[PDB]
Amino acid sequence: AYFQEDVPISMEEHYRIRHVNIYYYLEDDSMSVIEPVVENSGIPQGKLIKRQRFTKNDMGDHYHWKDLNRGINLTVYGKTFRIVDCDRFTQDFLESQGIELNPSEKIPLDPYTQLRKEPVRKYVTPSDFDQLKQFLTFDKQVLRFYAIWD
């Protein structure tokens, strides 16, 4: 999953975008949000939401896996997220149930993160030097055209 945020004061960006991992357990239907850790990130990584169950609507309902699918958004204690895609045992089990899977989608990348490092591109062009090959290969080789001018 991922989520967006807006920076009010910093020099670089309107916005930052962050990736996260969601683990839904099968034991007590707890869920946990974990951010992967990347160096020089300038954010406190680690654990973001400890072990507990989660509240969909006011009454006290609980996000039973019977309602989750690909391509779904959901608001959770304020901050809202969007689901991109899943992994092997996840879709196998979920189709064993028979939840109709939705077409996948690209996970975006942080422009701040890329501009931190570099443009990943190509190089190499010098000036123009291949005379030896022509000279040796084509020793005294000439052409003979008969042309007419009016």
Partner: protein, 438 residues
């Protein structure tokens, strides 16, 4: 621009020269043809390669190296080998008779009639050359051919072109192992004849290489191919700064300024930290703290000098690969805080740092690993005089019994130089002790 001249004297050192040029061809993709694949960069000779190879308009990177020897065996073999077209023909200079380990034989009886040719070749390099920062001579003290001839040629170059640098690596005599009992004689002769003409001398030993090989390379049956690959990697490290681009760079000028404190004394020691195998580097981890502790680990040094026996003057560290100076200087600070290491008061600062971003290189069919951070250690300290003491307390006995001096007088020399060399040494040890005196 920035380029040197490679000198490889002695069928002692020609195999290691062969190995090092073989290693050099990989990272630039020099094929044993001598020409590049499709991607064109050949031109006015302006890119990294030009520091080592003089590609003329031929498309053939020809090295600025010269091999000189008095045995035709190995040189004929190599010109029958693979890189024979790579090498230029008569910069492979050959003779027919060897010095038979005799320093004087290698210095006088034969030295007259080949210096002329090598002079011609070195000048015909130097003319087209423009940078001429210095020379990388590779020789041997116990030279069955190399020793005396090398001393004479470095004498003549010192007297003719005195405005550039001179660097020397050498295999050192094995302190408790011998290959020819001529070794104390030829060693002392070379040393004292060269002391007033040698800028910087670095020392390597086969026993230490071997011990490393079965301690961390963990292969009990090594080869010269292994020895030569390791030392070639060392020299590749020491020249990477000149070769490529980097955040900050250092040069032989800076080396000859900072490392040596005084006149005379110019004998530091080399070390390479991440000397380890592929599987180790694979499922272990590499980083600056542990490699830094390793560089001061006392058992990886290629000279059998006990650190706590001596004390330190200079430390030049070349960090090659991916690093930032923060943890680097933090680690060197932690080492300064460490108590066992004993800096003299002469050097409250002694840390010449050089950072080159470009990671090092593996070789196909090799035994090294896919390093990211390497650190090469060039340190000058007092713990080496033990070697000189070991040499002299045997030189004296062999002098007293005067065996093989009949050989030397028969080949036409005397005892006066042998006499004076010993107090030359004694002066060297006394100066070591005086500088150790705080």
């Amino acid at each position: 621009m920035r380029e040197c001249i490679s000198i490889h004297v002695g069928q002692a050192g020609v195999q290691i020269g062969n190995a090092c040029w073989e290693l050099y061809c990989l990272e630039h993709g020099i094929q044993p043809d001598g020409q590049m694949p499709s991607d064109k960069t050949i031109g006015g000779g302006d890119d990294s390669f030009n520091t080592f190879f003089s590609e003329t308009g031929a498309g053939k990177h020809v090295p600025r190296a010269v091999f000189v020897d008095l045995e035709p065996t190995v040189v004929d073999e190599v010109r029958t080998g693979t890189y024979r077209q790579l090498f230029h023909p008569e910069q492979l200079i050959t003779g027919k008779e060897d010095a038979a380990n005799n320093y004087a034989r290698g210095h006088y009886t034969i030295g007259k009639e080949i210096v002329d040719l090598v002079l011609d070749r070195i000048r015909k390099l130097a003319d087209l050359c423009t940078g001429l920062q210095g020379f990388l001579i590779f020789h041997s003290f116990g030279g069955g051919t190399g020793s005396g001839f090398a001393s004479l040629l470095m004498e003549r170059l010192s007297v003719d072109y005195g405005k550039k640098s001179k660097l020397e690596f050498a295999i050192y005599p094995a302190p408790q192992v011998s290959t020819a009992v001529v070794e104390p004689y030829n060693s002392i002769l070379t040393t004292h004849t060269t002391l007033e003409h040698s800028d910087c001398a670095f020392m390597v030993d086969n026993e230490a290489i071997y011990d490393i090989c079965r301690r961390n390379l963990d292969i009990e049956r090594p080869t010269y191919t292994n020895l030569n690959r390791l030392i070639g990697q060392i020299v590749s490290s020491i020249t990477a700064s000149l070769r490529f681009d980097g955040a900050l760079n250092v040069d032989l000028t800076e080396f000859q300024t900072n490392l040596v404190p005084y006149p005379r004394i110019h004998f530091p020691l080399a070390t390479y930290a991440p000397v380890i195998s592929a599987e180790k580097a694979y499922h272990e981890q590499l980083s600056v703290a542990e490699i830094t502790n390793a560089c001061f680990e006392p058992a990886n040094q290629m000279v059998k000098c006990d650190p706590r026996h001596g004390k330190y003057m200079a430390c030049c560290m070349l960090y090659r690969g991916d690093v930032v100076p923060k943890d680097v200087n933090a680690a060197i600070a932690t080492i300064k805080t460490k108590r066992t290491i004993q800096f003299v008061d002469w050097c409250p600062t002694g840390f010449k740092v050089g950072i080159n971003y470009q990671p090092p290189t593996v070789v196909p069919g090799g035994d090294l690993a896919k390093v990211q951070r390497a650190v090469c250690m060039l340190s000058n300290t007092t713990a080496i005089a033990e070697a000189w003491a070991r040499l002299d307390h045997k030189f004296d006995l062999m002098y007293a019994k005067r065996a093989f001096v009949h050989w030397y007088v028969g080949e036409g020399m005397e005892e006066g130089e042998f006499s004076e060399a010993r107090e030359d040494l004694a002066a060297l040890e006394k100066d070591y002790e005086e500088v150790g005196v705080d």
